[PDB]
């Protein structure tokens, strides 16, 4: 899966 | 036409009938 | 010293459980009071006690355990007497205590099946609730009130039932079967009590004077959720008394 | 029904308050005639503790409902004990076989355990008792 | 203790005027 | 995560901006995503805490629909959006997240293995859901993703609403968790959706597709109250006890019934805390509105079983709960069951109450009795005294009569020990909560032929060979017994023993309470001096009282070990103030001849208690010097229905208020008492017990004890005079409770003259409350507490500099006017000049004038509160008339917007001071006055246009025609804040019952102005522009104010009758408004 956030930015997760 | 009789209050007494 | 009734107390609780164990949770066909004449023995010395001590509140409790504990155990008539005993104790400094106690002595009475006694304590609750429970310092007070209901339709359902003649009937029965009728007034005279209970005592109250039997059983299924347990024991037997009289023997 | 006669059908105790005294004397008398029944008898006999307890034999008869009486290992708890002598006073008994039974089974527990002996001889002496019952011998109904 | 022990001086007294 | 967790809590209220705490919230987000399920519990417990107690500024982010965008394996298989879309509220996105990750596999009716989430987590995460869907509940409606799956793999797409399907989890707390789940759905839904619940639901059911329904949870709650674990059983009746009034005042009323019928065979558990919930949740219950749908049912009597009866809920609960519960062998479990029964006592109803004959008539007198409050303003006896009459309510009275009779009852029929202590417990409660000496008909037994209740009955119970020893219930059976004796006096006290007290009865009950309180205190006074038993007081021959003895001495000797220097429960000091208080209530029925020789026994007595209780010690030595002095009360005693309650008496007092508007020597035996209370002053934080000694010494120099020869060298001033530069530094904590007692002692220190010297003077005490000015504490906790001791000496009642004095002091108040307890100081001067110069007296009301009227044009006074509009309102009546002669003034200071209407706060300034001035207008000057000057001023009725209203929530003709609209524009204003604003997101609890007395208050003008006959140019105005379009939509059409009034009908049934008032005092008669109100042929008690 893949996340962004306002206050990140686009992280990553194992799957 | 029913009343209440003078000597008993329970019993009923009668004077159009 | 003091703590004497506490002793006397709790070992009439002690013979209590005893002749409750025999005679409700058991049921034993050989019991014979053994047990309850020492509770009534025991409760006697407390009362006394609590009476020389000054203490008549304290001995009117210990009348009250007694009278509860026989009327539990199938003897309503005794404990009429104790909880008039209570209420004679109470009255002078706790006159709703002494209400209490005369609505479970007419309660016990009516178990007894002696409505002539029945008729006579609500007559005397409903006389000291408007003594005690209903002036301005006019209308009841909430506690008082609940009483004064309670009294008005048990007397009307037992005025019903027994039918007194003159000088039986007493002012205070003739004033409150007046109210039960209808004449002159529309543009409230409920008074204490909930207006459509109210319009089906006033329509039992004429229906048992015209005999009408059907407008009684009709009312009798009507009224049936509004009344108490007792209440609808006393209305079945002003429809039983109607339908078949008592003293006829056949 | 038959624990209610304690109480909901116990005429003047406080749980009775929710029933007018034309109906309590009638319902009485029904539960413990209906308790008597040979379909229902067995089960009825049996304490409720017992069955918390597990017991849990196959029942036989013509309707399926035929317990055996109690092991008399169970009646020596106080409080399951004063269970069983509520009902074999309640009920009392419906034949000869039943006397015997119920005899035997008091005897089982006769041989502060003293309780229990107390209790015994209070549970003989009411069964002794029940069959000085005139119309019918054994039969509170 | 108090502030009239840590100045090592009297407490007065009650009285009316 | 533990630290944020922590932290969460106190910034709800250089300060924690919205970035910050999105950026909290965002790692919170990404750390559920860990690896490690100790990282996963950390993050689900953080995020439970920021969903339970929201920052203010998150808040909004969270809620608003794009709010963040506009500023071991992941298990989450497609789209669930991002807490950055633009295209709904982040709690869509956090709902989707938490279901996805812990709870639902994507596949209808599939449970997630507990191999692949353990329980702590599933719980948590149904928590959070649970958390988000209160603040949010369109959350709940949701598809599981945005973008379907592979559709091969998953034929029908999952909704959200299957986590309901956790309900018949093998883990209790998973179970209770989704039965608290359905508690918040049902009460978030019918408040959301103002209890259109029909037309909110087909709004989700349209934006979602989702099928689920409300009255599907109510089954899942039912279930759950028969679990077979505690643990569930406790969170399900937690969840009716969240969602019970709101279904009793919705369209499924009749389940609200139903779950109150389901929880009470709780009452019957094991689990105490079970029992305490069951308690907790009937205490919240309407029982009016219960009695009104009660009524209503046909065949929730019936139950499941065709029953024949009336089902009863109001006596099974009071009688077979909340009174059965006062029996229970926990005393935790009785103590909840006492305070249950005091919260039930105003909600209670029953038939042939003269207050209330019906039960929609006593909801419409709850309604109304918080909106329809009239704007209103305008030696001391002990705790339990009352020499004045009252105006007490019949039907309060009567409630508590029953409830007093059904506990006494139980009291006297009493078997058990547990029964006998909690029924004392609840009827001492009672007693605090309802006092005797107000509610003396609810109290009254028929005893006194103005009552004293049961106190005989209480007295035998201090009399038993038992009782006294379990010391909770004695000390209840003590305080209810003094406050039965209290009572009595407005009747009996008589204008050898106890002389007052006139009803002789009496006096047995009286000698009876003093005497035993002398025992239980000289018995804890050598329990303290650690002596041995072996003269009122004394009882070494009693053998009760060396049973008392042992008791109180175990209990004090276990606390002589331990250092609970916090705990309020320890039983010995509890007992010890129990009796001190209860002594100092009776000592106000005493004279000389009834304590004279037994002072010195009580004083040595109080020696020993000093050290334990000092506070409530002093309070005896007080009373004491009230009876030697002669100061105490025993020497100083020389029909309605709806149209009624919803307008009539509402506006027959508002139009009145409208109308009246401008129209010995035994005093050494003392000495030692008070020279501990001086010692212990200086040595100890208490701030009651330092504000005690103050009341102390003030009423020592009013008894004209010489205060120069007591307080040698002046120590004492010099000490307290050394905690100002404490108290304005900020360093002296809880300094709010104690500078009105220094104020107050300080201003009786300026009259004595023991000395030829003054020892304090007016001049410093102006400069120390000064000092306290210029210092930058808070005002209304500190300068204004300061202010009104001096402020009544100065004006009421204290050579002609005392004039400048007085003058400064003007100085000061003008300095704090804003604050409404100064413009209650500012009543109290202008009534002291009114009275002694009529000149000062105007002078003073145009100083104000022209100070006040400025500043309410520009928001600046403190007047968003009905206790502070209500001050401003008489101080205008307090005004001299020609101070507000010329209205042009008026005029300017009405007829002004603010300078935003995007915060409530600001609103509510506004329409508050316009109220004040609109109040002033209808009141003190006539219409033509008005309309003529308004004429020459030049103002408009595009002033708060649509337009400039619009503008002023994003941020920053005829003179009659002028008036009506600003009054007509005003209501659309209020009628838009209280339909379309959410509770905690954007308003208080407060803030939404102050815009509906403010809404109240404008829509009781608007019937004087058109009802009273006297502004007939307004009603001519009023009438034609009810009767227009919105000048091209430039203002409020009549439609508009009426969808928003019809929206009103089921949660402000008194504001929507007011407004068909004016509906019809504007002759708008139009049966689409009067069909929908009246329902005419072509549930909810509100809409009756």
Known sequence: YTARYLTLGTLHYKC | XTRHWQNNWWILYHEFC | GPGEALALTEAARLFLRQERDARQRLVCPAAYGEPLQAAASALGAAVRLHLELGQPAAAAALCLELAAALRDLGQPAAAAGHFQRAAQLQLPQLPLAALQALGEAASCQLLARDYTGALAVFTRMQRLAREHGSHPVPAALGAFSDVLVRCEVSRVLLLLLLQPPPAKLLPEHAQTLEKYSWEAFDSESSGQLPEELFLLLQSLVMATHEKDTEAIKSLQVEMWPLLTAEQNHLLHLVLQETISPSGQGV | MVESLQSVLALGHKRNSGVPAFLTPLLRNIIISLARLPLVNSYTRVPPLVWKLGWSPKPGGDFGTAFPEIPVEFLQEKEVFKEFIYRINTLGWTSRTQFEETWATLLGVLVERTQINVLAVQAITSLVLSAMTVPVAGNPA | XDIWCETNKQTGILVLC | ?1088
């Not at chain 6, 107690?53 to 629909?65: C, F, G, I, Y």
């Not at chain 6, 205008?876 to 200071?893: Q, T, W």
Request: proline share 4%; glycine share 4%; with cysteine.
């Open chain 6, 1 to 1088: 995560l533990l630290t944020l967790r922590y932290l969460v809590p106190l910034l709800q209220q250089v300060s924690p901006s919205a970035e910050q705490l999105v950026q909290v919230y965002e790692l919170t987000l990404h750390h559920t995503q860990h690896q490690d399920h100790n990282v996963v519990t950390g993050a689900l417990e953080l995020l439970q805490q920021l969903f339970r107690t929201p920052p203010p500024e998150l808040l909004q982010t969270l809620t608003a629909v794009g709010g963040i965008g506009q500023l071991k394996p992941c298990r989450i298989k497609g789209d669930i959006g991002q807490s950055t879309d633009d295209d709904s509220a982040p709690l869509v996105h956090c709902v989707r997240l938490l279901s996805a990750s812990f709870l639902l596999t994507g596949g209808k009716n599939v449970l997630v293995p507990d191999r692949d989430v353990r329980v702590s987590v599933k719980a948590l995460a149904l928590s959070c859901v649970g958390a988000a869907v209160a603040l949010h509940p369109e959350s709940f409606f949701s598809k599981l993703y945005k973008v379907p799956l592979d559709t091969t793999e998953y034929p029908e797409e999952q909704y959200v609403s299957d986590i309901l399907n956790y309900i018949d989890h093998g883990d209790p707390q998973v179970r209770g968790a989704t039965a608290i789940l359905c508690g918040t759905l049902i009460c978030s839904i019918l408040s959301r959706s103002r209890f259109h619940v029909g037309d909110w639901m087909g709004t989700i059911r349209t934006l979602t597709g989702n099928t689920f329904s409300l009255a599907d949870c109510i089954p899942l709650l039912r279930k759950t109250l028969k679990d077979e674990s505690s643990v569930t059983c406790k969170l399900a009746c937690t969840a009716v006890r969240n969602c019970v009034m709101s279904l009793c005042s919705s369209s499924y009323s009749e389940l609200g019934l139903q779950l109150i019928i389901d929880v009470l065979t709780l009452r019957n558990s094991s689990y105490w805390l079970v029992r305490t919930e069951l308690l907790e949740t009937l205490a919240e219950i309407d029982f009016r509105l219960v009695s009104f749908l009660e009524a209503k049912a046909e065949n929730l009597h019936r139950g499941a079983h065709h029953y024949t009866g009336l089902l009863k809920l109001q006596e099974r609960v009071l009688n077979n709960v909340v009174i059965h519960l006062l029996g229970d062998e926990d005393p935790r479990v009785r103590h909840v069951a006492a305070a249950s029964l005091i919260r039930l006592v105003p909600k209670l109803f029953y038939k042939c109450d003269q207050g209330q004959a019906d039960p929609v008539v006593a909801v419409a007198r709850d309604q109304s009795s918080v909106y329809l409050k009239l704007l209103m303003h305008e030696t001391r006896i002990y705790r339990g005294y009352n020499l004045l009459p009252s105006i007490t309510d019949v039907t309060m009275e009567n409630n508590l009569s029953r409830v007093i009779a059904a506990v006494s009852h139980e009291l006297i029929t009493s078997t058990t020990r547990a029964l006998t202590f909690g029924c004392c417990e609840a009827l001492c409660l009672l007693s605090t909560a309802f006092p005797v000496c107000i509610w003396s008909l609810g109290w009254h037994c028929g005893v006194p032929p103005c009552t004293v209740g049961m106190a005989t009955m209480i007295l035998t119970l201090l009399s038993s060979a038992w009782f006294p020893l379990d010391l909770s219930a004695h000390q209840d059976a003590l305080i209810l017994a003094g406050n039965l004796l209290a009572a009595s006096a407005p009747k009996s006290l008589r204008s050898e023993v106890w002389p007052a007290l006139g009803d002789r009865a009496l006096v047995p009950m009286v000698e009876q309470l003093f005497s035993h309180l002398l025992k239980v205190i000289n018995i804890c006074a050598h329990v303290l001096d650690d002596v041995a038993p072996g003269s009122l007081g004394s009882f070494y021959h009693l053998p009760s009282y060396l049973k008392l003895h042992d008791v109180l001495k175990a209990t004090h000797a276990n606390y002589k070990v331990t250092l609970d220097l916090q705990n309020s429960t320890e039983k010995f000091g509890g007992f010890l103030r129990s009796a001190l208080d209860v002594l100092s209530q009776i000592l106000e029925l005493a004279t000389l001849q009834d304590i004279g020789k037994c002072v010195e026994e009580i004083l040595g007595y109080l020696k020993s208690c000093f050290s334990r209780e000092p506070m409530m010690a002093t309070v005896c030595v007080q009373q004491l010097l009230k009876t030697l002095f002669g100061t105490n009360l025993a020497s100083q005693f020389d029909r309605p229905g709806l149209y009624h309650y919803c307008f009539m008496a509402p506006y027959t007092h508002f139009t009145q208020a409208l109308a009246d508007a401008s129209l010995h020597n035994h005093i050494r035996l003392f000495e030692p008492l008070v020279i501990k209370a001086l010692k212990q002053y200086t040595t100890t934080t208490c701030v009651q017990l330092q504000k005690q000694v103050l009341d102390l010494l003030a009423q020592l120099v009013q008894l004209r004890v010489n205060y120069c020869l007591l307080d040698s060298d002046q120590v004492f001033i010099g000490f307290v005079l050394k905690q100002f530069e404490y108290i304005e530094v900020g360093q002296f904590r809880e300094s709010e409770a104690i500078i009105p007692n220094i104020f107050f002692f300080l201003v009786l220190l300026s009259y004595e003259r023991y000395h030829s010297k003054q020892i304090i003077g007016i001049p410093k005490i102006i400069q120390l409350c000064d000092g306290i000015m210029a210092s930058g504490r808070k005002a209304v906790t500190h300068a204004i507490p300061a202010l009104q001791p001096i402020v009544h000496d100065l004006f009421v009642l204290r050579g002609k500099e005392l004039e400048t004095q007085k003058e400064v002091v003007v100085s000061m108040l003008l300095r704090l006017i804003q604050y409404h307890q100064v413009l209650e100081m500012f009543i109290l001067v202008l009534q002291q000049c009114h009275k002694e110069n009529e000149d000062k007296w105007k002078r003073l009301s145009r100083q104000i004038a022209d100070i006040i009227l400025p500043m309410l044009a520009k928001q600046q006074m403190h007047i968003d509160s009905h206790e502070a509009l209500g001050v401003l309102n008489t101080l205008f009546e307090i005004l001299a008339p020609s101070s507000l002669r010329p209205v042009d003034m008026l005029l300017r200071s009405m007829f002004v917007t603010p300078n935003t209407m995007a915060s409530v706060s600001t609103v509510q300034l506004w329409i508050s001071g316009i109220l004040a001035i609109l109040r002033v207008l209808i009141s003190q000057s006539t219409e033509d006055i008005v309309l003529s000057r308004i004429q020459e001023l030049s103002f408009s009725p595009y002033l708060i246009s649509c337009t400039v209203i619009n503008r002023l929530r994003d941020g920053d003709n005829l003179p009659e025609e002028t008036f009506s609209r600003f009054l007509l524009q005003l209501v659309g204003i209020l009628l838009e804040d209280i339909v379309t604003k959410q509770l905690k997101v954007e308003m208080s609890e407060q803030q939404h019952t102050f815009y509906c007395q403010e809404l109240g208050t404008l829509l009781m003008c608007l019937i004087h102005i058109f009802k009273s006959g006297m502004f007939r140019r307004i009603t001519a105005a009023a009438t034609r522009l009810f009767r227009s379009d919105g000048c091209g939509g430039s203002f409020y059409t009549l439609d508009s104010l009426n969808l928003r009034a019809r929206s009103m009908i089921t949660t402000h049934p008194a504001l929507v009758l007011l407004w068909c008032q004016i509906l019809l005092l504007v002759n708008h008669t139009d049966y689409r408004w009067w069909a929908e109100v009246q329902q005419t042929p072509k549930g909810m008690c509100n809409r009756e």
